[PDB]
PDB file of C-alpha atoms in Angstrom:
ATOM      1  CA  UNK E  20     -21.164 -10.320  82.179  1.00 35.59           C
ATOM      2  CA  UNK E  21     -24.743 -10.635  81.090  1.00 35.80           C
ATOM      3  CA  UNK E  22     -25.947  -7.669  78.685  1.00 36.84           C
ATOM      4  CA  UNK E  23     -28.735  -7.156  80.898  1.00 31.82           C
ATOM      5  CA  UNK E  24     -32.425  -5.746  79.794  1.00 31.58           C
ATOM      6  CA  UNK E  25     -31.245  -4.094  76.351  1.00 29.21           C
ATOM      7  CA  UNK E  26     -34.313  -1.594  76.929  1.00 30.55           C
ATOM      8  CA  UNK E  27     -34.505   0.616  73.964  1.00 29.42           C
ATOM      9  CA  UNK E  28     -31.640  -0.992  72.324  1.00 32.39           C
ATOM     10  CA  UNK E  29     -31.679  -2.507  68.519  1.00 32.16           C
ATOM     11  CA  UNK E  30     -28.951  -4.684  67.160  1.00 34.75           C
ATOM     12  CA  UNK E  31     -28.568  -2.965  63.433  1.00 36.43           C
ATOM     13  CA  UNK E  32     -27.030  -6.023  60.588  1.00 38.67           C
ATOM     14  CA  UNK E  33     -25.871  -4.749  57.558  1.00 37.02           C
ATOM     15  CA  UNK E  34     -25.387  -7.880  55.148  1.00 37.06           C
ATOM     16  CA  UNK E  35     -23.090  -8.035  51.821  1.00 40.99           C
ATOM     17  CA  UNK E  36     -22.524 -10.892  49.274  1.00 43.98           C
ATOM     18  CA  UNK E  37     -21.429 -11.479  45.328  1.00 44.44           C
ATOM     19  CA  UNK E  38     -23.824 -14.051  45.424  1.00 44.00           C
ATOM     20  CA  UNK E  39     -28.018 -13.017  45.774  1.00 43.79           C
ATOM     21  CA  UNK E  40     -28.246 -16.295  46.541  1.00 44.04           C
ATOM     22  CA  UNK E  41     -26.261 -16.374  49.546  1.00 42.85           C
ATOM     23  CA  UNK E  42     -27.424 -13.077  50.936  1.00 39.58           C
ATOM     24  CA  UNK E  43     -31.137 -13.661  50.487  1.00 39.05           C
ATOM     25  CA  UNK E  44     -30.995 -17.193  52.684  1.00 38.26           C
ATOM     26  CA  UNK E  45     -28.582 -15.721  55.608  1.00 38.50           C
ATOM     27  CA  UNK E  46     -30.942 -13.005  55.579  1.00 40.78           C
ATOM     28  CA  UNK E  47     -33.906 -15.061  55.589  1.00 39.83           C
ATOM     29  CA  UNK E  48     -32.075 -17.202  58.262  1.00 43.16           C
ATOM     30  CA  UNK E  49     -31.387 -13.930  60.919  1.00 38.88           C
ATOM     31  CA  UNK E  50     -35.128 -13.139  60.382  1.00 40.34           C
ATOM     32  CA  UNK E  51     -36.547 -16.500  61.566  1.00 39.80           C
ATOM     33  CA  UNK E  52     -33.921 -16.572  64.382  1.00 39.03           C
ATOM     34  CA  UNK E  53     -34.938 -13.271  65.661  1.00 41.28           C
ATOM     35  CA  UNK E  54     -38.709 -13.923  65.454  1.00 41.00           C
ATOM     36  CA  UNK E  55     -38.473 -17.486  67.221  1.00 36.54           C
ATOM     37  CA  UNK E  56     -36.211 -15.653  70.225  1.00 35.27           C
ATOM     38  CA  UNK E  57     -39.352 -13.498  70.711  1.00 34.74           C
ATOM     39  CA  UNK E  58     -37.564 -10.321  68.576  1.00 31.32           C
ATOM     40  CA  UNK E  59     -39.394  -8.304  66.187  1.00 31.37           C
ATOM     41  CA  UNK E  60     -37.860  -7.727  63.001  1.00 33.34           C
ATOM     42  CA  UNK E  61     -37.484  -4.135  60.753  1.00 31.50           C
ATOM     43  CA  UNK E  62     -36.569  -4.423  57.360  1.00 33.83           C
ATOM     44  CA  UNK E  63     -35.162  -6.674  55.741  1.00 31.41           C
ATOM     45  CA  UNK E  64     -34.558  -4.301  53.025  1.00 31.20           C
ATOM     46  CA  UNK E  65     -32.283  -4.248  49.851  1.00 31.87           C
ATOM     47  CA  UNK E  66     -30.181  -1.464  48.698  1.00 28.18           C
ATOM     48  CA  UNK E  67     -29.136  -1.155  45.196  1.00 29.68           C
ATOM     49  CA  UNK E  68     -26.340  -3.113  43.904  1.00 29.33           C
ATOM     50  CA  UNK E  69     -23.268  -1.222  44.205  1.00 25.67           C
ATOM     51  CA  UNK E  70     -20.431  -2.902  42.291  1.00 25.43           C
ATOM     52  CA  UNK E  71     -21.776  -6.538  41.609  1.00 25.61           C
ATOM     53  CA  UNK E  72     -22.635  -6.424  45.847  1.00 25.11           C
ATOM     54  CA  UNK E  73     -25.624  -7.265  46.721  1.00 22.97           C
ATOM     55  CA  UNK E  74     -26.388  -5.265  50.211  1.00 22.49           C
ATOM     56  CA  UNK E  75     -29.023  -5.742  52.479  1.00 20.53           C
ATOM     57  CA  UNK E  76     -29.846  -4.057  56.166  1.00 20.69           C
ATOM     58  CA  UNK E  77     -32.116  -5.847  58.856  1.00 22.57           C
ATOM     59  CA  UNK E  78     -32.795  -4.386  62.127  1.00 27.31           C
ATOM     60  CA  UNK E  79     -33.909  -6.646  65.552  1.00 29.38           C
ATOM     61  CA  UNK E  80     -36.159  -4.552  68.004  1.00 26.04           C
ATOM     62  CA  UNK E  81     -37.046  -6.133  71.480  1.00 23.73           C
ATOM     63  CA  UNK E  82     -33.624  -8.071  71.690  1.00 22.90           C
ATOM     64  CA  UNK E  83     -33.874 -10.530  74.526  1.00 23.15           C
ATOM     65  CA  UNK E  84     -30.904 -12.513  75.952  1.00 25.38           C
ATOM     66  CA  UNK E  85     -32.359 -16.146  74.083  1.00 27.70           C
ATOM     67  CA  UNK E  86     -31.987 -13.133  70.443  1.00 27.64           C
ATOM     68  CA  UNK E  87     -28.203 -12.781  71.000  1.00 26.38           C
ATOM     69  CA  UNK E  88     -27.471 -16.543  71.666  1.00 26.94           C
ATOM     70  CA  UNK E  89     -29.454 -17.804  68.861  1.00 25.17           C
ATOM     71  CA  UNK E  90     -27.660 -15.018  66.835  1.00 25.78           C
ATOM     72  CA  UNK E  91     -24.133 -16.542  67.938  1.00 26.14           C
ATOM     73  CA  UNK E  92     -25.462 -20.033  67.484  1.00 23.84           C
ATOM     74  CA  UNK E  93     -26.369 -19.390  64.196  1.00 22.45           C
ATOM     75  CA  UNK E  94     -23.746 -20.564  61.161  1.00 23.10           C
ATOM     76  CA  UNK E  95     -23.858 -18.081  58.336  1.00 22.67           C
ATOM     77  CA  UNK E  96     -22.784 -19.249  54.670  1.00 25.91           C
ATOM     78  CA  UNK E  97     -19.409 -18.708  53.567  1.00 25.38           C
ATOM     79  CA  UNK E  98     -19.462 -15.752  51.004  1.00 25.12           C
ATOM     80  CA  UNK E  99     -21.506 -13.105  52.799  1.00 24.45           C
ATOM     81  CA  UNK E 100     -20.190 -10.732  55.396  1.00 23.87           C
ATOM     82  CA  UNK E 101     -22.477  -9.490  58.603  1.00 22.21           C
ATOM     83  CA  UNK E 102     -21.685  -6.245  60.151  1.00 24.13           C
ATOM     84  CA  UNK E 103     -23.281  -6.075  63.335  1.00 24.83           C
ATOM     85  CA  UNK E 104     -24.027  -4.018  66.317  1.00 23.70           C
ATOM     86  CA  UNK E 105     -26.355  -3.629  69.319  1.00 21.39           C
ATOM     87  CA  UNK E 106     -27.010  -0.424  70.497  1.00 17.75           C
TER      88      UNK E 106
ATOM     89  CA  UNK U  26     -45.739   9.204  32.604  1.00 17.20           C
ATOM     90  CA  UNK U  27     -44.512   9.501  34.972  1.00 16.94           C
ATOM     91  CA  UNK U  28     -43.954  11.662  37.688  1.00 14.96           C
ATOM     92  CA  UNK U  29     -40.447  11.144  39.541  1.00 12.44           C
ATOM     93  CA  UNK U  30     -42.324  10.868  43.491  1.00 11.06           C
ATOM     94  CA  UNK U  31     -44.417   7.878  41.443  1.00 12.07           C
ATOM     95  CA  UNK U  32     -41.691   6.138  40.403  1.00 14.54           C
ATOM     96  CA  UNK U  33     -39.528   6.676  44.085  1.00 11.22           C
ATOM     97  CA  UNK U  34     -42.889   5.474  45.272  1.00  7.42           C
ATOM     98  CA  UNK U  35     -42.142   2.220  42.959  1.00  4.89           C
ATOM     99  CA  UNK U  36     -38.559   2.237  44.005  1.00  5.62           C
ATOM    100  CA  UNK U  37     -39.728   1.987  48.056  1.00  7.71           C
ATOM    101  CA  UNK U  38     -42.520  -0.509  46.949  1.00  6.74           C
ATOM    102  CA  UNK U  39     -39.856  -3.038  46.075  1.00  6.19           C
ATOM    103  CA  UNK U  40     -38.054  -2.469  49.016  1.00  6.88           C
ATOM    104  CA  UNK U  41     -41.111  -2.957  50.907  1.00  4.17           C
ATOM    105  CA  UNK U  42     -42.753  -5.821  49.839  1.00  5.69           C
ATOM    106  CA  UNK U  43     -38.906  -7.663  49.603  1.00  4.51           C
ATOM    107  CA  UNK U  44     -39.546  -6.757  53.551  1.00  3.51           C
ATOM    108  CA  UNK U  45     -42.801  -8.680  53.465  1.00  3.25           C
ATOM    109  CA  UNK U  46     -41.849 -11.273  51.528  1.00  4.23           C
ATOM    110  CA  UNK U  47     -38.952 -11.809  54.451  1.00  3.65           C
ATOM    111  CA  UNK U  48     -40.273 -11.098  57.612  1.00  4.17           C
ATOM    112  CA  UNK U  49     -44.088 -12.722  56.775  1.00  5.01           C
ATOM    113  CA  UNK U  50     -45.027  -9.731  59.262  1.00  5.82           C
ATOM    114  CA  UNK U  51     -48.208  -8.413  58.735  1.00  2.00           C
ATOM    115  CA  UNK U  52     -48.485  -5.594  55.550  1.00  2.00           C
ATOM    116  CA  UNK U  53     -50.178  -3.000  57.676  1.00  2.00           C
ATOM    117  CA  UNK U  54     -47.194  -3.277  60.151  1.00  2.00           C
ATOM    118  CA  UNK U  55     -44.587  -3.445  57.312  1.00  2.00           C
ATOM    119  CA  UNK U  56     -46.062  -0.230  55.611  1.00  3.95           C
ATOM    120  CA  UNK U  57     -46.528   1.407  59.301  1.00  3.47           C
ATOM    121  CA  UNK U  58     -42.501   0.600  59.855  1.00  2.00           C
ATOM    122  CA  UNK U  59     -41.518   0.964  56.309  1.00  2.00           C
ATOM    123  CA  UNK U  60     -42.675   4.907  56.265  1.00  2.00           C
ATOM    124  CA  UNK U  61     -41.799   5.680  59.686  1.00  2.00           C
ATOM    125  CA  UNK U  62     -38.079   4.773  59.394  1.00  4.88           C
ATOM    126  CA  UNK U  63     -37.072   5.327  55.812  1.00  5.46           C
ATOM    127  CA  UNK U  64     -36.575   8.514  53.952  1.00  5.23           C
ATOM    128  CA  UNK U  65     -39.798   9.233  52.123  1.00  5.75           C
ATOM    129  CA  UNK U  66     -39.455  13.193  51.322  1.00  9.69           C
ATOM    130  CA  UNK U  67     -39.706  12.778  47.496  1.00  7.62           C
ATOM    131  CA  UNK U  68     -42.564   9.373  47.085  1.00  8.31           C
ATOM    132  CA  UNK U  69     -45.788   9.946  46.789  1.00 10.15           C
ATOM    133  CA  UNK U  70     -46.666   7.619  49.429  1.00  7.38           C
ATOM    134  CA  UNK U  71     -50.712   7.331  48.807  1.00 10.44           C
ATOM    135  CA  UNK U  72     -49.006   5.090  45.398  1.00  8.78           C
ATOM    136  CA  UNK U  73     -46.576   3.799  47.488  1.00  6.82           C
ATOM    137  CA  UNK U  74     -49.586   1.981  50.402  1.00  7.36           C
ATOM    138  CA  UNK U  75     -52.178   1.746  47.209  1.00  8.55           C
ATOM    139  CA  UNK U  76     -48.786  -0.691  45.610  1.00  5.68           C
ATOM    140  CA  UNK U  77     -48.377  -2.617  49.059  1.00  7.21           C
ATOM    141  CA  UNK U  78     -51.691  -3.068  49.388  1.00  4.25           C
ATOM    142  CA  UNK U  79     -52.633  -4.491  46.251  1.00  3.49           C
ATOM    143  CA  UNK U  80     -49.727  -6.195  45.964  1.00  3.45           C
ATOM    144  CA  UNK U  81     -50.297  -7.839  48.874  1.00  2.80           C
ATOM    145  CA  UNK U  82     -54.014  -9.487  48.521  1.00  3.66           C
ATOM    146  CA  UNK U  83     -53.580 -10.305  45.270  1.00  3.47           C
ATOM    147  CA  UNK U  84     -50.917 -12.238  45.790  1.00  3.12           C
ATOM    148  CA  UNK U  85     -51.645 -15.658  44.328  1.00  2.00           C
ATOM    149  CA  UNK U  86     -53.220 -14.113  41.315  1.00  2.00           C
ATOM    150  CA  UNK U  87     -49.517 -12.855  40.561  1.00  2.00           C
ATOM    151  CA  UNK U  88     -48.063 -15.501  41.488  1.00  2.00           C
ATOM    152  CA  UNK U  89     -50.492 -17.798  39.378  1.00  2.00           C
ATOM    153  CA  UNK U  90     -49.353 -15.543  36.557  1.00  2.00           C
ATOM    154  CA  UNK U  91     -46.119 -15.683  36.763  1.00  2.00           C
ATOM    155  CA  UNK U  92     -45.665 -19.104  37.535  1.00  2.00           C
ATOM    156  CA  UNK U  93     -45.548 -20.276  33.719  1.00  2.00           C
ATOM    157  CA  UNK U  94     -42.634 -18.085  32.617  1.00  2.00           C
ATOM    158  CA  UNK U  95     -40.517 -19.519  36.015  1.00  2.00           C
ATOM    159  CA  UNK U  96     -40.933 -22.985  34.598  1.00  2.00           C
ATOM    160  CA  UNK U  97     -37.425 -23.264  32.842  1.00  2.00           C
ATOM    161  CA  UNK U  98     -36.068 -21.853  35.958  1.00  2.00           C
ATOM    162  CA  UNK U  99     -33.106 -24.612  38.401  1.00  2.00           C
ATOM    163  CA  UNK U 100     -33.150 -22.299  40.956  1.00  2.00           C
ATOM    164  CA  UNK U 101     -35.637 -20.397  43.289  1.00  2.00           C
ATOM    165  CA  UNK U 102     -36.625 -17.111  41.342  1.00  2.00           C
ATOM    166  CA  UNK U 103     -34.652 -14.112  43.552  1.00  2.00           C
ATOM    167  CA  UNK U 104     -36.462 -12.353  46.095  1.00  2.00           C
ATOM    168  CA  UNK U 105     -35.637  -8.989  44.327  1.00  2.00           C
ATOM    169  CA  UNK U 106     -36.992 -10.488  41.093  1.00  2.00           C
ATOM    170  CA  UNK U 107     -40.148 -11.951  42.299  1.00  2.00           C
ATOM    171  CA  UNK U 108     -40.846  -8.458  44.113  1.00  2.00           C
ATOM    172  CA  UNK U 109     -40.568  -6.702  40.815  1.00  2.00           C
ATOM    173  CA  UNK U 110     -42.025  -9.160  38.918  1.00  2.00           C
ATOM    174  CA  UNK U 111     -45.300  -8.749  41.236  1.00  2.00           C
ATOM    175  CA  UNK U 112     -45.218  -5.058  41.241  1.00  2.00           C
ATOM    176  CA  UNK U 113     -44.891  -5.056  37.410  1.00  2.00           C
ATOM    177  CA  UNK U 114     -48.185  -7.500  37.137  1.00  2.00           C
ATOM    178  CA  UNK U 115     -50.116  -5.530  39.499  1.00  2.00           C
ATOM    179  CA  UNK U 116     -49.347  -2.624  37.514  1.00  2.00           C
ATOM    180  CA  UNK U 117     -50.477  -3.970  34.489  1.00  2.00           C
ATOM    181  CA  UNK U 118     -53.182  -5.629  35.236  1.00  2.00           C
ATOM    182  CA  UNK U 119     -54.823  -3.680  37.939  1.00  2.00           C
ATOM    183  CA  UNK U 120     -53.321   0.009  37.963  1.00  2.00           C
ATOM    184  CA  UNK U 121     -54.236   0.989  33.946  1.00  2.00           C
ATOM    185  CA  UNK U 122     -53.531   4.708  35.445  1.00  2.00           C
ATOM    186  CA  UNK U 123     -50.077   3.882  35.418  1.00  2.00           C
ATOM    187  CA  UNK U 124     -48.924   3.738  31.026  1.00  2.00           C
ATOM    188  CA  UNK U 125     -47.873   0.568  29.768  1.00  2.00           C
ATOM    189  CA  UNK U 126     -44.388   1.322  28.642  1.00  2.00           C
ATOM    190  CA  UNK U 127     -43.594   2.904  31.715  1.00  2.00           C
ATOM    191  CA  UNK U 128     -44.758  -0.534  33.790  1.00  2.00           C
ATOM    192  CA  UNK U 129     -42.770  -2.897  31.968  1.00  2.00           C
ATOM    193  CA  UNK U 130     -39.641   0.206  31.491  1.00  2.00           C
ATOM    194  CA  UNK U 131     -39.540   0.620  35.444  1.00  2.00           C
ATOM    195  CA  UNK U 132     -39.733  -2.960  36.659  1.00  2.00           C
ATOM    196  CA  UNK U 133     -36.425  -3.668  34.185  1.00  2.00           C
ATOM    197  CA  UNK U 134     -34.592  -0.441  35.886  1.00  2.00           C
ATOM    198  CA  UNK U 135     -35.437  -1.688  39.255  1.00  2.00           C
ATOM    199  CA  UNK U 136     -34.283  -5.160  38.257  1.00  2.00           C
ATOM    200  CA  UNK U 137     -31.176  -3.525  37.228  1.00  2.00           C
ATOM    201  CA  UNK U 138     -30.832  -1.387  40.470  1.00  2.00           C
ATOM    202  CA  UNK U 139     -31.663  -4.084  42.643  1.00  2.00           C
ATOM    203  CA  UNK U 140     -31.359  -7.947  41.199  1.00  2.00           C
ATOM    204  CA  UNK U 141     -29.045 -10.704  40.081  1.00  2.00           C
ATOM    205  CA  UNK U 142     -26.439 -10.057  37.648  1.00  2.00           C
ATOM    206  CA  UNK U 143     -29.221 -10.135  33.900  1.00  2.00           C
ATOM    207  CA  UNK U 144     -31.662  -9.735  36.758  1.00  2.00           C
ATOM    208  CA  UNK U 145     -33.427  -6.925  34.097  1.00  2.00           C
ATOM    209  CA  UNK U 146     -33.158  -8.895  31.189  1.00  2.00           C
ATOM    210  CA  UNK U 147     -34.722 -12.322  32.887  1.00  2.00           C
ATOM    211  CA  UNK U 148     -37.668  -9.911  34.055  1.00  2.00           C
ATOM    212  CA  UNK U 149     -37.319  -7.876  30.100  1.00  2.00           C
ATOM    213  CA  UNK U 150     -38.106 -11.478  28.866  1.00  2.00           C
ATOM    214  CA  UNK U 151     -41.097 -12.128  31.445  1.00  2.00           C
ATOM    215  CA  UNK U 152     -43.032  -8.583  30.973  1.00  2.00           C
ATOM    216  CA  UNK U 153     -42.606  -9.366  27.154  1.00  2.00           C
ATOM    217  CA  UNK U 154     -44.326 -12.378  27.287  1.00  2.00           C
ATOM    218  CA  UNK U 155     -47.075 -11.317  30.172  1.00  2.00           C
ATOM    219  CA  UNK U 156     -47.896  -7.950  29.671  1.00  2.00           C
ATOM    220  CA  UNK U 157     -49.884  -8.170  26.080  1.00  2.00           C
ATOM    221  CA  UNK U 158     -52.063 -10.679  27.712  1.00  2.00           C
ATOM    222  CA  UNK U 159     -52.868  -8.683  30.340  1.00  2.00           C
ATOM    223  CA  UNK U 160     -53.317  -5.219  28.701  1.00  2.00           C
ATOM    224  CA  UNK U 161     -54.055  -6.670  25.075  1.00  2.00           C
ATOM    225  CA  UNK U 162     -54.435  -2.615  23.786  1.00  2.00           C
ATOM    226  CA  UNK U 163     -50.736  -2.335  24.871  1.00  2.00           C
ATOM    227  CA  UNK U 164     -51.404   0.927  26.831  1.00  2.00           C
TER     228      UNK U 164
END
């Protein structure tokens, strides 16, 4: 079923890639899909490099139902893996 | 220089302004956010807001003098690099409190903590191109 309200809840994205290329645009991409759903965005910030991986973390605040669809909707690049979670 | 909650503050300033440059949220609410969620124990955070700040509105001035050294370049300059690279200008050309050496020594460390693979070399190459012109005494 539906995931209802989501009050207080934040879906956390962590984001890793070889390629800054890659990482920077899917991260880029999550940010303008979040802030068009009517989400507010944390971060994105970058970590340091940690053995030729780029990392990055992104946080959505204010999730709404039109947030998580636009989320699954959205194709991300081959070559970068999304951990996510909603919580 | 310098002391180590400076250059943390430095180290966070990256971080923060990559934010900006992301999210195009407002600065205030990006240096608001920034400090109230991330680990700030050991920056001296008066740099750190001074850095966002100034970063952000002067903006095109850094990018204006950057943008003849990115001429050569196929691809977009990084997000990482172009944070640095604005940090590093602003530095030099507007925050003469900070030494000259240590400027240009902690944008390549930061470039080589954070950036593309010879991410501290391209931005080596830059500052030794830019930095002279902006601080002509070299200090």
């Amino acid at each position: 079923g539906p995931l209802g309200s989501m009050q207080n809840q934040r879906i956390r994205i962590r984001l890793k890639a070889f390629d800054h290329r890659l990482i920077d645009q899917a991260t880029a991409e999550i940010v303008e899909t979040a802030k068009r759903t009517g989400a507010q965005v944390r971060g994105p910030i970058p970590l340091p490099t940690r053995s030729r991986t780029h990392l990055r973390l992104v946080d959505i605040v204010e999730p709404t139902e039109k947030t998580v669809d636009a989320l699954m909707r959205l194709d991300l690049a081959a070559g970068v893996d999304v951990q996510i979670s909603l919580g | 220089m310098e002391p180590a909650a400076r250059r943390r503050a430095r180290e966070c300033a990256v971080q923060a302004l990559y934010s900006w440059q992301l999210s195009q949220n407002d600065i205030a609410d990006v240096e608001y956010q920034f400090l109230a969620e991330q680990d700030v124990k050991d920056v001296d955070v008066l740099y750190f807001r001074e850095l966002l700040a100034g970063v952000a509105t002067n903006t095109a001035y850094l990018d204006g003098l950057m943008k003849p050294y990115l001429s050569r370049l196929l691809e977009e300059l990084g997000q990482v690099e172009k944070a640095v690279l604005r940090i590093a200008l602003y530095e030099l050309s507007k925050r003469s409190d900070v030494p000259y050496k240590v400027a240009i020594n902690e944008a390549i460390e930061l470039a080589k903590s954070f950036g593309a693979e010879d991410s501290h070399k391209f931005v080596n190459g830059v500052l030794d191109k830019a930095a002279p012109v902006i601080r002509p005494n070299k200090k």
